[PDB]
Design a protein around this motif. Structure first.
Motif, short mmCIF file in Angstrom:
data_model
loop_
_atom_site.label_atom_id
_atom_site.label_comp_id
_atom_site.label_asym_id
_atom_site.label_seq_id
_atom_site.Cartn_x
_atom_site.Cartn_y
_atom_site.Cartn_z
N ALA A 139 1.14 -4.27 3.93
CA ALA A 139 -0.33 -4.71 3.85
C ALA A 139 -0.35 -6.19 3.60
O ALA A 139 0.36 -6.91 4.54
CB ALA A 139 -0.75 -3.73 2.60
N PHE A 140 -0.56 -6.41 2.49
CA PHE A 140 -0.93 -7.99 2.30
C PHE A 140 0.59 -8.79 2.11
O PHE A 140 0.42 -9.91 2.25
CB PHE A 140 -1.62 -8.28 0.96
CG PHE A 140 -3.18 -7.78 1.14
CD1 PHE A 140 -4.07 -8.16 1.58
CD2 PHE A 140 -3.39 -6.46 0.36
CE1 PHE A 140 -5.27 -7.69 1.79
CE2 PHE A 140 -4.89 -6.13 0.56
CZ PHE A 140 -5.53 -6.59 1.28
N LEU A 162 2.70 -8.51 4.49
CA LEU A 162 3.01 -8.53 5.88
C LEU A 162 3.53 -9.89 6.03
O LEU A 162 4.47 -10.23 7.07
CB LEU A 162 2.00 -8.12 6.98
CG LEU A 162 2.00 -6.73 7.31
CD1 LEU A 162 0.83 -6.69 8.30
CD2 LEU A 162 3.31 -6.26 7.84
N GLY A 163 3.03 -10.94 5.54
CA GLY A 163 3.69 -12.33 5.72
C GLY A 163 5.26 -12.42 5.73
O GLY A 163 5.88 -13.16 6.29
N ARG A 204 6.98 -10.68 8.25
CA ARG A 204 6.96 -11.71 9.45
C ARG A 204 7.99 -12.85 9.32
O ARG A 204 8.65 -12.94 10.43
CB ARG A 204 5.30 -12.14 9.65
CG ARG A 204 4.66 -10.85 10.30
CD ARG A 204 3.24 -11.46 10.52
NE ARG A 204 2.51 -10.49 11.33
CZ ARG A 204 1.19 -10.20 10.96
NH1 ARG A 204 0.64 -10.60 9.43
NH2 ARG A 204 0.47 -9.23 11.34
N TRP A 261 3.42 0.79 2.83
CA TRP A 261 3.12 -0.19 4.06
C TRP A 261 2.95 -1.32 3.44
O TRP A 261 2.17 -1.68 2.52
CB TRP A 261 1.93 0.26 5.02
CG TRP A 261 1.84 -0.82 6.12
CD1 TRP A 261 2.64 -0.93 7.18
CD2 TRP A 261 0.63 -1.57 6.50
NE1 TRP A 261 2.14 -2.08 7.80
CE2 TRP A 261 1.04 -2.23 7.44
CE3 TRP A 261 -0.63 -1.37 5.82
CZ2 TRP A 261 0.02 -3.09 8.34
CZ3 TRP A 261 -1.47 -2.36 6.57
CH2 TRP A 261 -1.20 -3.23 7.43
N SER A 296 0.96 -1.12 0.01
CA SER A 296 -0.07 0.22 0.16
C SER A 296 0.91 1.31 -0.05
O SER A 296 2.10 1.22 0.43
CB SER A 296 -0.86 0.00 1.08
OG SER A 296 -0.20 0.10 2.40
N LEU A 356 -3.33 0.76 -3.53
CA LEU A 356 -2.81 -0.80 -3.40
C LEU A 356 -1.89 -0.74 -4.73
O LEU A 356 -2.27 -0.58 -6.00
CB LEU A 356 -3.74 -2.02 -3.42
CG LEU A 356 -4.53 -1.78 -2.19
CD1 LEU A 356 -5.51 -3.08 -2.30
CD2 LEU A 356 -3.68 -2.03 -1.07
C1 LIG Z 1 -4.44 0.47 2.78
C2 LIG Z 1 -4.54 -0.62 3.77
C3 LIG Z 1 -4.73 -1.77 3.23
C4 LIG Z 1 -5.18 -3.00 4.12
C5 LIG Z 1 -4.18 -4.23 4.21
C6 LIG Z 1 -4.85 -5.35 5.11
C7 LIG Z 1 -3.44 -6.26 5.18
C8 LIG Z 1 -3.90 -7.49 5.97
O1 LIG Z 1 -2.81 -8.31 6.48
C9 LIG Z 1 -2.89 -9.60 6.54
O2 LIG Z 1 -2.10 -10.05 7.78
C10 LIG Z 1 -2.50 -11.44 8.17
C11 LIG Z 1 -2.15 -11.86 9.39
O3 LIG Z 1 -3.11 -12.88 9.80
C12 LIG Z 1 -1.81 -12.44 6.79
O4 LIG Z 1 -2.63 -13.61 6.87
C13 LIG Z 1 -1.55 -11.70 5.64
O5 LIG Z 1 -0.25 -11.74 5.25
C14 LIG Z 1 -2.34 -10.38 5.35
O6 LIG Z 1 -3.08 -10.53 4.37
#
Ligand SMILES: CCCCCCCCO[C@@H]1O[C@H](CO)[C@@H](O)[C@H](O)[C@H]1O
Ligand SMILES: CCCCCCCCO[C@@H]1O[C@H](CO)[C@@H](O)[C@H](O)[C@H]1O
Ligand SMILES: CCCCCCCCO[C@@H]1O[C@H](CO)[C@@H](O)[C@H](O)[C@H]1O
Ligand SMILES: CCCCCCCCO[C@@H]1O[C@H](CO)[C@@H](O)[C@H](O)[C@H]1O
Ligand SMILES: CCCCCCCCO[C@@H]1O[C@H](CO)[C@@H](O)[C@H](O)[C@H]1O
Ligand SMILES: CCCCCCCCO[C@@H]1O[C@H](CO)[C@@H](O)[C@H](O)[C@H]1O
Ligand SMILES: CCCCCCCCO[C@@H]1O[C@H](CO)[C@@H](O)[C@H](O)[C@H]1O
Ligand SMILES: CCCCCCCCO[C@@H]1O[C@H](CO)[C@@H](O)[C@H](O)[C@H]1O
Ligand SMILES: *C[C@@H](COC(=O)CCCC)OC(=O)CCCCC
Ligand SMILES: *C[C@@H](COC(=O)CCCC)OC(=O)CCCCC
Ligand SMILES: *C(=O)CCCCCCC
Ligand SMILES: *C(=O)CCCCCCC
Ligand code: NA
Ligand code: NA
Ligand code: NA
Lengths: 444, 450, 446
Positions: free
Chosen positions: C327-328, C330-331, C334, C325, A84, A112
C-alpha cells in the motif's frame, strides 16, 4: 536529537612534493583530460570508446544505482509506514479463564496498519546519514575506476607502440647484420676471409631474428588488452592500431598544485565517505542506549462476524504507543556499540593508509619521471656513439684493417643501445601516465 | 547436554626440514627479535617505529576489538534477558467474543519483560565457543600481520641498501671508464690511436652513466615504501637513510627446532581457530534437532485504565514456559546441519592447505639460502678475476700490447661481475628474511581477555 | 503467476580465432585429457595425485555442498512448515476488558503450529530459482578451479624440467670452459700465452659455475610447488622427479572448434549462473509489489487445567488466513526493486567481462604459441652456429697467434644460445598449457 559522534572530515595536510618546483613541471595549471596532451587522435579515440564500452565501468555504475536504491529504502523509515491487511482468526476450543466448553470463535479485520518509530534520539537519521555517505562512496569508487581505466589503457597503448618501435629497431639491425653476414661469405669465398667469421655472423643474425617474434607477441598481447579495456572482442576492434611513433609531451607537464592531489583523487574521497558512514553507524548503535518510542495504528474494520466487515457497525481504530528500553540488557547494547566504535576506528586507519599510499604513489611517480629523463640523455648518447662505431668498424672490416670480432661487437652494441633507448622512451611515457594517475586525473 | 562434536585440534605432524641439520644453521636457539642479529641500529629503529605507526596494524587491532564485541553480545544469551516497557493499546471498535457494540477499549502495561532460552542442549554454549575461537583467530591475524610487516620492512631496507651498493659500484666503474675514455682520446691525439677506440669508449661510458639514475630511482622507491610501512609521509621520514653497508650475519643462523614452526606461525593458529569455530558451529546446528526450551516473564503493572498504573491494584506478573520442536520441519533443520558440516569441512581443508603452504615457504627459504651462499662463493671469485683482468688489460692497452676491444670487454666484465655479486649479496640478505618469515618469528603475544 | 523477468541465457556469439585455421592445430577434435598428449607417465601420475589430494579442490567441493544445503532449506518454503509446541501461561493480574480484579490466570497448549506463504506471485519459486542457479555456479567454480589447478601443475612440471635442462647445459659448458682455461695456462707456461688469458678464463669459469646453484634453487622451488599442488608435504612427495627431458607434442594440437570454448569454460558458466541467479532475484523483489497471502494454523489441545491436555474435551484448532499489501509503503518496495535491477545489470556486465577476458586469454595463447614456434627456429640456428664457431675458435686459439677474446666470446655465445634455446623450449611447453587452459580443458562433463 541525534546522538553519537557528529562526523567531521579529518584535517589531512596537503600533499607536499618539493621536486614539482623544478623545470620538467608546470604547477600553474592542471589538465584534467591529461592524455590529450600527447596529441594522438588514435589514443583519444581509444579512451572515448573505453568510457562507453568498458564492462568494469558498467559494473561500477550499477553498484552506484544499487547504493542509491538502498538509501532510498532507508529514507522512508523517517515517516510512518502504512500497509494494508485483511485477516481472520477462526477456531474451536476452550477459552481459558472464560469457559471449559469448546466454543467457536471468529475475528475478522480489514484495514490499514501503521508502524512509526518516532526518531527521538536519531537512530533513523544516523542510518540515513550512513546510507547517503555510502552512496557518495560508490560514486567515488566509479570515478576511481575511471582514473584507473584511463591510466591502464593509455599505458597499454604505450606498451603497444613500444613493441612496434622495438620491432622496427630489431628489423633495421637485422638488415645491417644480414649485410655484414653477406660480406663475411664474400670475403671467405674470395679467399680473404674465414669460415669462423661467417659462423659468428650467422649466430648473431639468428639471435637478432629470434627477437622479432617475441616483440610481435608482445604487441599482440597489448592489442588484446586494449580490446578488452574498450569492451570489445579481440577480432572486432574498431580503431586502427597499425604502427605509429610513440607519443611525446615536449611542454612542461601541467600538474597543478600537488597540494590538491588528495582532494582530487577519488580513492581518497571513497575512503573518507566510508569513514563518514562508519561514524554515523556509531550513532545508530549509540541510540540503542536510550529508549525506543514507537507508535502503531490500525484503521478500518473489526468484527466477530465476517458479514459485518465494511459496515459502519464494524468500523474500528486503534493506536499502540510503546516505549522500550534495554534495561538489564544494556550490556548487550554496549557490546554492539563497542563493535561500531571498532569498525569506525578501522575505517579511520584505512583512510589514513589510503592517504599514505597516495602520497607514496605520487612521490614515486615524480621521482621516477625525473630519473627517466636523466637516464634517456645518457642512452641517446650511447646510441649515437654506438652507431658511429658500428659504421666505422664495418668500413675497417671490409677494408681488411680490423678483425670481424670488432664489427660483431660493434653491431651487438648498436642493437643493445638502440633497444635500451627505445625501452627508456617507453618508460618515460609510462612515467607520465603514472604521474597523472597519482594526481587523480581523468574522472567525470 | 552440550550436543554436537567436541572439537579436538588436528594431530598435525611437526615440520621436518633435513637441510637444517647443516653448518649454515643453529638449531639450539631461536631468536624471536630476529632482525637484531644484523647488528644494525638504523634497522632496529625502523622496526620499532613501524610497530607504533603502521596503519594496517591499527586496522587489525580494530578488527580484534570488533570480534571481542561480537563475543560479548553472544555471551549474555546464557542468562535471562530482561528489558523494560511501557505500552498501551487504545481504540474504539467491536471486541470479538465479548461484544458486537463498538466500545472504547484501553489496556496499559508497565514493567519488565524477561526472555530466557534454557540452554538444555548447549546451543548457546556452542555459539559462545565459536565466538571465543573467532576472537582468538582475530588475535592471530594481528600477529600474522606483525610477522608480515616486519619481514616486508626488513626486506625493503635490504633493497634500499642494495640500490645504494649498486650505485657505488656503478660510479666506481664509471670512473675507471672515464679514465679509459680519456686515454683513448690522448692516444688518438698522439696519432697512435683510433677514432674507433674513442667512439667505443664513449658508448660504454654512457651505458654505465645511464645505470646510475635507474639505481637512484630504485632507492627512492624503497625509501617511499619504508615511509608508508612506518606510517609516515614520504617527506616526513626522520630516520637518516644515507648509505651504509648492507647488513650481514656471520654466525650460524639461530632457527630453533623446525618442528616448532607450525605452532609458532600465527597464520596456522588463525586457521586452526577458524576450524575450531566452524566445529562449534556444527554443534549449534545440531542443537536444532532437539527441542528448544524457553521461559518468558512479565513483572510490573497491567490495567484497563491508565490511571491505575503503578497502583497495588494494577500489579501483575506472568510466566510463559515454552517448548518447541521442529517436528515436520526437521528437513530444514537437517539441511542447515549439512550446511554447517560442509563449512567445517571447508575450514579443515583450508587449515591443511595453510599448513602445506607454510611447509612450502619454509622449504623454499632453506633451499634458497644454501644455494645463495654457494652462488656467492663463485661470484666473489668472478669479481676478483675480473678486476685483475681489467687492470692488466688497461696496462697492456696503454703500452700498446693489446687492442682496445680487449680492454673494453674486460671493463664490461668487471662491472657485470661486481654488480652480479652485489645483487647476490642482497639475495642472501633477502633469504635470511624469508627464513625468519617462514618460521613465524617476531610477533607480540596478546594479553587476551578475562 | 511467477512475476518478474523470465531469464534467458545471453545469445553470446561463438569465439572466432582465425589463426587456428593453420598448420600447428587440429580442429577436428578436442582432447579433454589434454596433458596425456605429452606421453609422460610421471606427469600423468602427478595430475592424478593432485585430483586426489589437492586441498583447494576439497574446499571448493565443500562450498558446493554448502550451496546445495542452502538451496534445500529454501525449497521447503514452498510448503507449509509444521512445527510442534508445548506451552503454558500462568500469572496473576487484571484482565483488561474482562475484569479489574487481579485474578489468577492459567492456560496450557500442546499441538502443531503451521505457517504457510501461499506462493501466488512466485516469490518463493523465484527464491528457489536463485538458490538453484547459485548452487550451479558453485559447481562451475569447482570445475574452473580444477582447470586452473591442472594447468598450474603441468606448467610447474615444465618449469622443473626447464631448470634441470638448463643445469645440464651449464655443466656441459663449464666442462668446455675448464678445458679452455687449461689451455690458457699451458700456453702461458710455454711462453706463448699471457696471464691476461688465464684471468679472463677464470672469470668466465666462475660466472658459469655461479649459474648452477641458481638453477638448482629454481628446480627445488618447482618441486615444492608441485608437492603442495598434490596435497603433499615437501619431503613426502610420492612421485620421483629426478631429471627427464622436457615433454613435447609433435602432432598437430587437438583444439577442437575454438568456437566452442565459451561453452566449455567453467568460469563462463559460473558467471552465467550468477547472472541467472540475479535475474531470479529481480523476480523476488517484483513479487513484493503484489499482495502476500498466508495461512497459519494450530491443531492440538488447549485447556485451563493441565490435566485436561490430551483429552477430547481439550481438543482445539484454529486457522489464520491473511492477505497483506504494501500500500503506502510501495515506495520502499520500488526502491528494493531498483536495487535488484541494478544488481542484475552488474551481473550482466560481469558476465560480459568474463567473456571478453576469456577471448583475450585464448587470443593471447594462440598468438604466443605461433610466435614461440617461430622464435625457436631461430634459436636452434643460433645454437648450431654458436657451437661450430666455438670449436673453430678453439682450433684457432691453439694455432697460437690469436687473442683469447675470440675464444672467450665464442664460448659465452655458445652458452648464451644453448640456454636461450632451452628457455624457449620451456616457453613452447608453457604455451601449450596456456592454450588448453584458455579452451576450458581439464574438467570432464558427467
Ligand atoms: C486497502 C488499499 C489501500 C490503498 C493504498 C493506496 C496506495 C498508493 O500507493 C502510492 O504509490 C505512489 C506511486 O506514484 C507512491 O507515491 C506512494 O508510495 C504510494 O502512496
Ligand atoms: C567513534 C567514536 C565514538 C565516541 C562517541 C562520542 C560522541 C557522542 O556519543 C553520545 O551522545 C549522547 C548525547 O546525549 C550521550 O548521552 C552518549 O552517552 C554519548 O556517548
Ligand atoms: C496513529 C496515527 C499514526 C500516523 C498515521 C499516518 C500519518 C500519515 O502517514 C503517511 O500517510 C500517507 C498517505 O496518507 C503515506 O503516503 C505516507 O507514506 C505515510 O507516512
Ligand atoms: C532511560 C535511561 C537512559 C540512560 C542513558 C543510557 C545509559 C548511558 O550509560 C552510558 O553509556 C556509555 C556506554 O558505552 C558509557 O560510556 C557512559 O559512561 C555511561 O554513562
Ligand atoms: C525502568 C527499568 C528499571 C530497571 C533499571 C535497569 C538498569 C540496570 O542497568 C544495567 O544492568 C546490568 C547490571 O546488572 C548491566 O548490564 C549494566 O551495566 C547496567 O547498566
Ligand atoms: C488449515 C491450516 C493449514 C493446513 C496445513 C496443511 C498440512 C499439510 O502440510 C504438510 O504436512 C506434512 C505431514 O503429513 C509435512 O510432512 C509437510 O512438511 C507439510 O508441508
Ligand atoms: C513439543 C515437545 C515434543 C518433543 C519431542 C522431542 C523429540 C526429540 O527427539 C530427538 O530428535 C532428533 C531429531 O530427529 C534426533 O536426532 C534425536 O536422536 C532425538 O532424541
Ligand atoms: C499455493 C501454491 C502455489 C503453487 C503454484 C503451482 C505450481 C506451479 O509451478 C510452475 O509450473 C509451471 C508450468 O509447469 C512452470 O512453468 C513454472 O516454472 C513452475 O514454477
Ligand atoms: C535528544 C535527547 C537529549 O537532548 C535533549 O535533552 C533535547 C530534548 C528535546 C525534546 O533528549 C530527548 O529527546 C529525550 C528527552 C529527555 C528528557 C528526560
Ligand atoms: C499474476 C496474475 C496471474 O493470475 C491470474 O491471471 C489468475 C489466477 C489467480 C487466481 O495474478 C493476478 O494478478 C491476480 C489478479 C486478481 C485480481 C483480484
Ligand atoms: C531531538 O532532536 C528530538 C526531535 C524533536 C521532534 C519532536 C518530538 C515530539
Ligand atoms: C500463478 O498464477 C500461481 C497460481 C497457482 C494456483 C494454485 C492456487 C491455490
Ligand atoms: Na523502507
Ligand atoms: Na546479547
Ligand atoms: Na526451510
Amino acid at each position: 536529537c541525534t546522538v553519537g559522534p557528529d562526523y567531521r572530515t579529518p584535517d589531512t595536510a596537503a600533499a607536499k612534493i618539493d621536486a614539482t618546483a623544478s623545470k620538467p613541471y608546470d604547477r600553474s595549471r592542471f589538465e584534467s583530460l591529461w592524455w590529450k596532451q600527447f596529441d594522438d587522435p588514435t589514443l583519444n579515440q581509444l579512451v572515448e570508446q573505453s568510457l562507453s564500452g568498458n564492462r568494469d565501468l558498467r559494473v561500477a555504475f550499477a553498484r552506484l544505482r544499487a547504493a542509491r536504491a538502498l538509501r532510498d529504502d532507508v529514507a522512508n523509515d523517517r515517516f510512518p509506514v502504512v500497509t494494508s491487511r485483511a485477516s481472520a482468526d477462526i477456531g474451536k476450543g476452550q477459552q481459558p479463564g472464560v469457559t471449559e466448553d469448546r466454543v467457536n470463535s471468529e475475528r475478522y479485520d480489514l484495514g490499514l496498519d501503521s508502524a512509526w518509530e518516532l526518531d527521538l534520539f536519531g537512530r533513523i537519521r544516523r542510518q540515513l546519514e550512513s546510507s547517503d555517505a555510502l552512496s557518495e562512496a560508490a560514486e567515488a569508487d566509479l570515478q576511481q575506476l575511471q582514473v584507473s581505466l584511463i591510466a591502464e589503457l593509455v599505458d597499454a597503448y604505450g606498451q603497444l607502440r613500444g613493441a612496434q618501435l622495438r620491432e622496427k629497431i630489431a628489423l633495421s639491425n637485422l638488415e645491417n647484420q644480414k649485410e655484414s653476414r653477406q660480406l663475411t661469405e664474400q670475403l671467405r669465398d674470395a679467399g680473404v676471409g674465414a669460415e669462423l667469421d661467417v659462423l659468428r655472423a650467422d649466430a648473431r643474425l639468428a639471435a637478432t631474428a629470434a627477437s622479432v617474434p617475441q616483440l610481435q607477441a608482445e604487441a599482440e598481447r597489448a592489442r588484446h588488452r586494449i580490446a578488452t579495456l574498450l569492451g570489445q572482442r579481440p577480432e572486432e576492434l574498431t580503431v586502427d592500431l597499425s604502427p605509429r611513433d610513440l607519443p611525446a609531451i615536449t611542454k612542461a607537464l601541467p600538474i597543478g598544485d600537488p597540494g590538491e592531489l588528495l582532494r582530487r583523487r577519488p580513492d581518497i574521497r571513497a575512503a573518507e565517505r566510508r569513514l563518514a558512514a562508519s561514524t554515523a553507524d556509531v550513532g545508530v548503535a549509540t541510540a540503542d542506549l536510550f529508549p525506543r518510542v514507537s507508535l502503531s495504528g490500525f484503521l478500518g474494520f473489526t468484527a466477530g462476524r465476517g458479514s459485518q466487515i465494511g459496515s459502519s457497525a464494524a468500523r474500528a481504530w486503534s493506536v499502540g504507543p510503546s516505549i522500550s528500553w534495554a534495561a538489564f540488557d544494556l550490556g548487550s547494547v554496549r557490546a554492539r556499540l563497542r563493535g561500531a566504535k571498532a569498525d569506525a576506528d578501522a575505517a579511520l586507519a584505512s583512510y589514513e593508509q589510503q592517504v599514505l599510499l597516495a602520497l607514496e604513489e605520487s612521490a614515486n611517480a615524480f621521482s621516477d619521471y625525473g630519473k627517466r629523463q636523466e637516464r634517456l640523455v645518457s642512452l641517446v648518447r650511447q646510441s649515437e656513439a654506438s652507431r658511429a662505431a658500428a659504421q666505422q668498424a664495418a668500413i675497417r672490416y671490409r677494408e681488411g684493417t680490423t678483425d670481424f670480432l670488432v664489427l660483431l661487437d660493434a653491431e651487438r652494441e648498436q642493437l643493445s643501445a638502440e633497444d635500451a633507448q627505445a625501452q627508456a622512451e617507453v618508460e618515460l611515457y609510462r612515467g607520465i601516465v603514472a604521474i597523472y594517475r597519482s594526481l587523480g586525473g581523468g574522472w567525470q
